[PDB]
Write a protein that binds this ligand. Structure first.
Ligand SMILES: Nc1ncnc2c1ncn2[C@@H]1O[C@H](CSCC[C@H](N)C(=O)O)[C@@H](O)[C@H]1O
Length: 274
């Protein structure tokens, strides 16, 4: 209830993001579309990927509960007696920061048209080795022209609020962010707690985007675009197709607290070169 409009927005944002890049891929492949969802969670991107008519989906999360949970969502959608075609899926429980997904694939020679990391990548930055391995699992299997897309905290905006704050903690009634130490912002291992209304689930790490961009180059990825949630909304809402979708999802106008929570995050996408 409290977080309603914010919940809606992220699924609007993720749908518009996926929809955009599924078109860019369809301008090339338009067949056997393979996708890797990193940190798939309990699913929820499933219905998004079905909408885009994906031919294959690899869902992976470090939590075995979320993976088995996500697998039931797929099966539930899959097992209707209807005609509707659903992507061939795959479910892999692994730590993508510390593990190599290539070993866990049914087909280890598998290639992906799209890799979606939604509110995940910031977890991998605990260390360089971890942060690089996550980029590896994602981008190494992208066939050229494929996209690495996702969403992570800004880290310009995060520190900006921290430095303005009197204590290490900052936020509002709908969310609370607590850094372990203020003023020290190491490229890796910079650690803070992200607590939505609820209990804080796991610590996050600071992702400075210029760094993520540099490390992505290792895997031959060039940045397509990087935009804050504010910039993304302003632009993509220009389309009156998308504006209908947001009012349909009943997202959009939130409390000043909800609108504050967003604009911390930024969407991004990379493209694999030859
Ligand atoms: N190293 C890791 N490997 C895989 N998943 C991870 C991970 N670290 C965190 N995660 C997962 O990141 C997710 C955060 S939220 C769920 C994101 C999902 N794409 C959605 O939009 O619903 C959690 O599921 C968490 O288990």
């Amino acid at each position: 209830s409290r977080i309603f409009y914010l919940r809606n927005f992220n699924n609007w944002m993720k749908s518009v993001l996926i929809g955009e890049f599924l078109e860019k891929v369809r301008q090339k492949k338009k067949r056997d579309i393979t996708v890797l969802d990193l940190g798939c969670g309990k699913g929820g991107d499933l219905l998004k990927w079905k909408k885009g008519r994906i031919n294959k989906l690899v869902c992976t999360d470090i939590a075995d509960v979320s993976v088995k949970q996500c697998q039931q969502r797929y099966e539930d959608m899959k097992n209707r007696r209807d005609s509707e075609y659903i992507f061939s899926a795959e479910f892999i429980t692994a730590d993508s920061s510390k593990e190599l997904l290539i070993d866990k694939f049914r087909d280890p020679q598998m290639c992906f048209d799209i890799c979606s990391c939604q509110f995940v990548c910031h977890y991998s930055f605990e260390s360089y080795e971890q942060a690089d391995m996550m980029l590896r699992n994602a981008c190494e299997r992208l066939s050229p022209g494929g996209y690495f897309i996702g969403t992570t905290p800004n880290s310009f905006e995060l520190i900006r609020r921290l430095e303005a704050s009197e204590t290490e903690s900052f936020g509002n009634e709908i969310y609370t962010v607590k850094f372990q130490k203020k003023g020290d912002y190491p490229l890796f291992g910079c650690k803070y707690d992200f607590n939505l209304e609820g209990v804080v689930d796991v610590p996050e790490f600071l992702v400075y985007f210029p760094l993520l961009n540099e490390m992505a180059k290792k895997y031959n990825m060039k940045l397509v675009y990087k935009k804050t949630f504010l910039e993304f909304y302003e632009e993509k809402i220009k389309n009156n197709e998308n504006k209908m979708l947001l009012k349909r999802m009943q997202g959009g106008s939130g409390s000043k607290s909800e609108w504050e929570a967003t604009s911390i995050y930024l969407v991004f996408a990379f493209e694999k070169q030859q």
